[PDB]
Amino acid sequence: TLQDIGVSAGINILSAFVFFIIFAVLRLQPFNDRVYFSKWYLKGLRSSKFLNWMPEALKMPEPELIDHAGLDSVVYLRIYWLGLKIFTPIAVLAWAVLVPSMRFWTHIVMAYAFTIWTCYVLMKEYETIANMRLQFVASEARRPDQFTVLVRNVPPDADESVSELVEHFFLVNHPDHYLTHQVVCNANKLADLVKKKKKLQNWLDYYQLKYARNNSQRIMVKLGFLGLWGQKVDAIEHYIAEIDKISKEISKEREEVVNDPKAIMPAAFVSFKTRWAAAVCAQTQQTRNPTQWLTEWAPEPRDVFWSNLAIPYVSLTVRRLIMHVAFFFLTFFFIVPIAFVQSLATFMKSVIQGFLPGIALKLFLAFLPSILMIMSKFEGFTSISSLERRAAFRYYIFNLVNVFLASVIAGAAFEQLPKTIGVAIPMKATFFITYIMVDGWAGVAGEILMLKPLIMFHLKNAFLVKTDKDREEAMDPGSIGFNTGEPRIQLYFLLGLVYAPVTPMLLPFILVFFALAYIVYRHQIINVYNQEYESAAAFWPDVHGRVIAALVISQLLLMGLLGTKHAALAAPFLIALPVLTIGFHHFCKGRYEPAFIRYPLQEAMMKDTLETAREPNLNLKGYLQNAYVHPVFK
Amino acid sequence: TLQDIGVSAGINILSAFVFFIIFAVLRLQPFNDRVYFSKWYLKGLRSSKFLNWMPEALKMPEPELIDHAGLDSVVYLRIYWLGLKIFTPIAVLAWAVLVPSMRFWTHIVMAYAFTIWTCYVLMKEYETIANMRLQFVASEARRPDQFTVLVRNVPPDADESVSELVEHFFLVNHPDHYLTHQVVCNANKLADLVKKKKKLQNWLDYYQLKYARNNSQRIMVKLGFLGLWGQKVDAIEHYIAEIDKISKEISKEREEVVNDPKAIMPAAFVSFKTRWAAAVCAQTQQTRNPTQWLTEWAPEPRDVFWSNLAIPYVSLTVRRLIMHVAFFFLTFFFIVPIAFVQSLATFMKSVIQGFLPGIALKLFLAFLPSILMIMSKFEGFTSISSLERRAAFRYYIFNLVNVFLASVIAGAAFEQLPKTIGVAIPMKATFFITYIMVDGWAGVAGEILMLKPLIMFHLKNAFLVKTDKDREEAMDPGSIGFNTGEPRIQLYFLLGLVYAPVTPMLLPFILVFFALAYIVYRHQIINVYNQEYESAAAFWPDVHGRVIAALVISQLLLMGLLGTKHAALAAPFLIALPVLTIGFHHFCKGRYEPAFIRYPLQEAMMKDTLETAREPNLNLKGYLQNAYVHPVFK
C-alpha cells in the first residue's frame, strides 16, 4: 500500500517537526533549563534559527565526549554508527541490483556479499571497541571496585562467623596482598522502613505546603472518593505521629540488625592492596568445590544492587527456572494483543489501517521493559549493570520470538483467508515499514522532548519544593536507558538483515532512523543523561553476539523462502553460510573477547606501578575499609 | 544367521583358549621372564592349574594399584568397569522386556530408562574420578612440572634476546615468585644426527657379532639382493668410518647449535618458587594481546615432545587446516576397503562369510592408529599426553563416521539388491556381533601374549646382546596404548547403546568383552606396561564427552528408526531426550570439570605449605635450573 506508506511517513514527519518546534520553544525558556540541561549541572558547570542544535551536537569529539559522559554512553552511541556502516552499502547495492532462475542466484550472491560485509564491519568495530576499553581502563582514575572482589557462598561453619572464616581463608591463601574485608549485611527490611519514612515525609510536606497556601480542611484519606474508613480532616498530626512511629521503628530495626547474627549473609567483599592481587583472585578457581568460595569482580558501590545480596545462593537455580517459566507464559499470552494489532492491520479506512497498528503496538510495548526489569530484579544479580544486560537480553528474546516471528506468521495466516508463506513473508513489508516509521522517527522525536521528566520536575516545583537547594534532588535525568535502546536497535538490525535481500524497500527507513537516533542521542549524551553505573562497555560482547544471531536468522529465513520455488538448488550454499558465520563469530570470540572478560596481569601491574609512583603515600586501607558498607549505614 | 554366529563364537573361544594355553606355557618358562614381567623389573623388585592368574589379578586393591602403576592406568582400567556398570542392567532389563503400537511406546520408555541409567552412572563415576584425581595430585611427590610453565609465542624484539625478554617480563609481572627460566632450543637436526648414529652403531654391532660368530664374507649392501651399487665384502671398516664421520658431524652440529641465535625459538619454560605462583601464572591472561605471552601448564620432562617445540606458533592454524583436509581424504578413501569387507559379508560359504569380515577388518585397521599418531605428531602438540588424546579423538571420529555409519549404510545398500533403512539397520546385528566377537574376545586373548614384543626381545638377545646390563635397555614394554584402547571401547559403548533398544542380542557379547578386557588389562597393569607419562587422568573429560555423544547419537538413530512406521508419534519425546542429555552434560561440566581443567589455589597453597614444612632446606633453584634443558644436552 504505497499510499498508506506515504501518508504514514508524511504524518510522522509532521509529528517530528512539531516535536522539534516544541523542543526549540522549551529550550530557550529559562526555567526548564534545570531539566533540559541536567548534565553541565550535575557536573557543576552552569547555573540559572532553532534547529542549529543538530550541527552543534557534532562538536566535542570522542575523547572529550568519553571523559564527559562515560565509555558506556560512547559505545552505545557508536552502536547507531555501526548500524549506518552496515546498512548504507547494503542498501545502495540492493537498490542498484533490484532496479535496472537468474533471480535466485542473484539473491544468493547478494546474501553472500551482505554477510561478508556485515562480518567485516563487525570485526573492525569489535577490535576498535576492545582497544577503546583497554585504553580507558588503563587511564581510569582510582575506584574501590578495582581492588575489591565479591566472594559468594562462603561455606557455613558451626563455630566460626562469616567474617572470621573469610579473614582466615584469605590470610592463608593470599598472603601479603589481602588488606581488608567487609561482610554483606541483610538490611532489606531496614531499607524498606527508610523508604516508607521518606514517602511519608514527602506526603507530609505536600500536605503542609497545601495547607500553608490555602487554609481549609482536607478529608481525603489517601484516595479522596473511597479512601480509608476515617475522616482525617487535618491529618497533619496524623502524619507527624506516623513519622515519629516510623522513626522509632527504624531505630529499633537498626539496633536489631547491627547485632543480629542471622542478618549475616554467607558472602563478603574482599579488598587487596594491589590490582594485580585482585585480578589474580578474580580469575582463578579458589577451592576444590566449584560451588564454594565463588569469586567474581565486585561492582562499584553505586552499582551494587544491595537488595539482592540477601538472596541465598542455593535458590538461584530455582529462581532462574521460575524466570524461564514466567517468561514462557508472558511470551505466550502476548501474541493475543499483537494478534489483535495484526487484525487491525486488515479511503476512510486506508489511513487508519496504515497508521494505527504502529501506535497501538508502541503503547502495547510501553510497560514491557518495566516488566522485564522487575522480573530480573526479582531474581538476583547484585549489580545494576548485570540487571540491565539480562533485561535487555530477555527483551531481545521476546522481541525476536513474538513481534517479528509471531507477528509475521499471524499476519500471513490472516492473509491466507499448501504453504504460501513464501509469498506471504515479504508482504508484511508494509506493516513493518509502518511500525519502524512510527517507533523510529516519531518515537525518537517525541523522546527528545522529555515530556514526562519535565512534567514531573514542574510538579515537584509546584507542590514539593519548599525552599532552595532541593531542586538539585528534584532533578533526576535518568540513565541512558540501555535496557530499552539496545533491544530496539537489535530488532531493527535483525529485521533489516532479514528483509534486505527480499524487500529492499525496507532499508532506506532503517538508515534514516539510524541517522536520526544517532543525532538525537548524541545531543542527549552531551547535555543530559548522567550514567548510573560506569562499566567498561562490558555489554559489547552481548551486542555482537546478538548481531551475529540476527545474521544467522536472516540466512535461515532466506534459505526457507528461496526453498519454496522449484529448481532452487540454494541449499548447498545457504547451509554453508551459517557455518561460515558461526566460525567467524568463534574466531572473533577467541581473538578479542578476552579483552572484555579477562583482566591482563601486565596491565594490572602497570596501572599499579603508575599509581603508586604518582601517590607514594596513599592510605589504601583507610580508603577501602569504610566503603562497600551499605547505603543505609551512611 | 544364528549358525554363523555360533560357529564364530565357538572358533573364537577355541582361539582364546589356545592363546591362554600358550601364555601359560610361556609364563612358566624362565628366560622370557624379562618380557613377561617388565614391571617388577623397571621398579627393581625381581631378578632371574594354569589359569589361576585370573583370580590372582584381582588382589592388590586400588591404593596399591595406583601407587604401583599410575592413576592414568587405574582410570583407564576403570573405564571397563564403567562399561560393565552401564551395560549390565540395560542388558538384563532389555532381555526381560523383549522375551516374555505397544511395541513403539515400549521401546520409547526403554530408551528413557536406558538414558537415565547411563546418565546417573556417568555422573557418579565422574565425581569419583574427580575425587581420585584431586587426592592423587595432593599426595603426589615433587615433580618439576608442578613449578614450571610453558610460555608460547614471545613477541620478537629487534635488540632483546628471547631470554632477556622473558627474564625482564616475568621479573616485572611476577615479583618475589619467579625463580628461573629455560629457553626452548631448536635441536631437531642434532637429535636426528644422534638417532642416525645410534642406528649405525647398532648395525655395526650386529655385523661385528655376526662375523665373530662366523668368519665369512658378507656382501649385502643394506638389501642383499638389489642393494647399493657396491660390494662391501667386509663393510666393518665402512661402518667404523661412518661412525667416525657421524661423530665429527654431531660435534660440529653441537658447536653450531650452542652459539646460533637462529636456533632459539620464541618460547621458554618458566619456573616459580611456589606452586601457588605457578598456578596463578598458568590460568590468567598475561597481556593485552591474547596471542602473545600465551601460557599453559608445562608437561614433565619425560613427557615433553621436544621435536615439536621448534614449530613456529603462527603456522599451527595452517597445520590444523591441513590436518582436517587430510583426515577428510583418509575417511573418504577408507570406505572402499570397508565396502569390500561388507561385500565379503554377503554350507562351505556360510562359515567363511560369517567369520572372514571381522578378521579382514581387524587387519585393515591395524596400522590406522599408527597413521593417526603420525599425523598428530606431524602437527605439533609438544606433549605425548596431548598427542595421545588428540590421536584418540581423531580415531574415535573416524571410527564413528566410517566403520559404524558408513559400514551400516553400505551394507544396507548391498542388502537392498522407498527407504527400507528402518528394517535394514538392525539386520547388521549379525555382522557387528562377528566383528565385536573377533576384535574383542579373541583380540584381547591374543593381545595378552605379547607375541611381537617377545619376538623382538628374543631377536635382540640373539643378534644384538653382546654383554650383560644391556638387556635392561633391550626391554621396552611400551605404554598402556591409550590411543588404541580408548577409541575401541568408545566404539563398543556407542554401538551397544545404539542397538540396545532395537537388537538386544548385541548386549551379552559386549558385557563379556568388557569383563575379559577388564581382567586381562588388570593383569597387564599389574605386571607389565610401565607408563610413559604421568597425567592426572586429564582425559576423563574427553571420555565422558564421547560417551555423551554416543548417547545422543543413539537417541537420534532411535528417532530415525522409529519414525518410519506409520502412526509413530515418537518425535515429541525423542526430540526432548537429546535436550535432556545435553543439559545433563552441561551440568556435569560446570559441576566437576573444573577439578580437571583448573588448579585450585587453596590446594596449591596447602601442598606448598606441607612440602616446605617437610623439607625446610630444599634447593628448588638448583633442582629446577638444570632440568627442562633437552634430552640431547644430557
UniProtKB/Swiss-Prot annotation, chains A, B:
Activated by hyperosmotic shock after mannitol or NaCl treatment. Activated by mechanical pressure: activated in response to membrane stretch and poke. Membrane lipids play a key role in mechanosensation by acting as a wall mainly formed by lipid head groups. Changing P55R: Does not affect activation in response to poke or stretch. One of its GO terms (biological process) is monoatomic cation transport. Residues 505, 565-567 are extracellular. Acts as an osmosensitive calcium-permeable cation channel. Specifically conducts cations including Ca(2+), K(+) and Na(+) in vitro. Inactivation or closure of the channel is calcium-dependent. Mechanosensitive ion channel that converts mechanical stimuli into a flow of ions: activated in response to membrane stretch and poke. Belongs to the CSC1 (TC 1.A.17) family. This is Hyperosmolality-gated Ca2+ permeable channel 1.2. It comes from Arabidopsis thaliana (Mouse-ear cress).
